């Protein structure tokens, strides 16, 4: 269906097809030398150059080599420098470049490729949509929002643009504005709209505005396979792990860790209070838009299984104690952090990103009334020197209506059923 042969390439079509047939059969090494001779004998053939780049792509896949793939990326670009390149071939080659550049983590490089595509094909709406994705991946929501606005100005009912526009609005706390975009986008059925991210935030946005129909979108996200359950809505999951809102120390197996926290809880408290009094700046405000109201800060010692050395200078005894427990210092999908919360604070119902961690809370300073945490349909209270354990991949919520501050210690551990091989291989979150 795609036209990939310019006038000259049609005159060597049998040579080109013979080389491609070698590649489709999996004879990658013979297809590499086939297209190499084609590139040597016809250095201006776009189809021969695309064949070279495609063989390198399969060779990188076969060898799991980033460097080989990097050679493919450059060759994909060489196709676009050749003269008399068909438009279909020009798009395929450069789109695959951005795709492989993202797979390697070269977000700034994919960005340039995507910009060249929009310039070379200013009437392709999908290429503008892909440019917005490149921005969303690098962290540039401002340029991502302008892109989808330009898309919506021309094609206002493009569903892909609507869900991404809605996602950007929600992330910017424009809750009410984002609902009609996330809803119309998902309902459009356009390619790219059936994504758990859009179901997740559409139901959360509706929850924040008191829209009772929020769970209808959680239910449909479960039916479409994006959520393990209507309650447990994490999106970076290992399937099969025991789903349970609340956990007991013995259920987790980390009883040695729980005893150490509950035996030495006062030293952990004291170092926290000491930071509160003489190093307030180490406590950083929560910055994921999880608060309806109030004040909430976190002092993080371990993140992504990495220890912050300067943070541990503020709690050296606590960091010394925790280093004996790799099930938490090595949880690259969790943290170790003090969490302080003051009266007048309500944390929105939310869920964490992954089901691969369990979350421990050690009570350090707990006022006698006004503090409580709900996970799923069960609500509990903290206690000074005791450890609660819950799966934050379930929906959870917190209120702080005391008359003084409430300080706890948050300790994430790998899900107990995760094998050591999985704990080493899972990408960090």
């Amino acid at each position: 269906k795609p036209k990939l042969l310019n006038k000259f390439d049609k005159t060597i079509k049998a040579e080109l097809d013979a080389a491609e047939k070698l590649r489709k059969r999996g004879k990658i090494e013979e297809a590499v030398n086939a297209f190499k001779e084609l590139v040597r004998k016809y250095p201006q053939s776009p189809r021969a150059r695309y064949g070279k780049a495609q063989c390198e792509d399969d060779l990188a896949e076969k060898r799991r080599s980033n460097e080989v793939l990097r050679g493919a990326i450059e060759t994909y670009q060489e196709v676009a420098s050749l003269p008399d390149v068909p438009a279909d071939l020009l798009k395929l080659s450069l789109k695959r470049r951005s795709d492989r550049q993202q797979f390697l983590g070269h977000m700034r490089g994919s960005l340039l490729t995507l910009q060249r595509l929009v310039q070379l094909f200013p009437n392709d709406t999908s290429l503008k949509n892909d440019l917005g994705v490149g921005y969303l991946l690098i962290g540039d929501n401002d340029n991502a929002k302008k892109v989808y606005e330009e898309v919506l100005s021309v094609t206002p009912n493009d569903g892909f643009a609507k869900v991404h526009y809605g996602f950007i609005l929600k992330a910017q706390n424009k809750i009410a504005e984002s609902i009609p975009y996330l809803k119309e986008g998902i309902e459009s059925g356009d390619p790219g709209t059936d994504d758990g991210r859009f179901y997740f935030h559409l139901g959360d946005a509706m929850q924040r505005v008191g829209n009772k129909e929020a769970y209808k979108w959680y239910e449909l996200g479960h039916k479409r396979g994006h959520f393990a359950s209507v309650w447990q809505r994490s999106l970076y999951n290992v399937n099969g792990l025991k789903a349970q809102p609340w956990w007991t120390p013995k259920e987790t197996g980390y009883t040695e860790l729980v005893k150490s926290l509950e035996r030495n809880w006062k030293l952990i408290r004291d170092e926290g209070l000491a930071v509160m009094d003489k190093a307030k700046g180490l406590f950083l405000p929560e910055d994921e838009n999880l608060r309806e109201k109030g004040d909430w800060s976190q002092f993080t010692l371990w993140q992504q299984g990495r220890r912050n050395e300067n943070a541990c200078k503020g709690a050296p005894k606590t960091c010394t104690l925790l280093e004996k427990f790799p099930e938490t210092t090595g949880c690259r999908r969790g943290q170790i952090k003090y969490s302080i919360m003051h009266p007048g604070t309500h944390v929105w119902p939310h869920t964490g990103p992954t089901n691969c961690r369990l979350r421990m809370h050690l009570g350090l300073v707990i006022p006698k009334e006004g503090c409580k945490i709900r996970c799923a349909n069960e609500t509990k209270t903290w206690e000074e020197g005791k450890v609660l354990i819950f799966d934050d991949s379930f929906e959870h919520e917190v209120w702080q209506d005391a008359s003084s501050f409430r300080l706890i210690f948050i300790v994430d551990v790998w899900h107990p059923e995760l094998t050591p091989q999985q704990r080493r291989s899972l990408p960090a979150i």
Binding site: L235, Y236, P427
Partner: peptide, 19 residues
């Protein structure tokens, strides 16, 4: 940005190529 407590980012992992 990183997804520490929620799912607010478009992507929560960092791409590092092949494994």
């Amino acid at each position: 940005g990183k997804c520490k407590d929620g799912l607010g980012e478009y992507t929560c992992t960092s791409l590092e190529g092949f494994e």
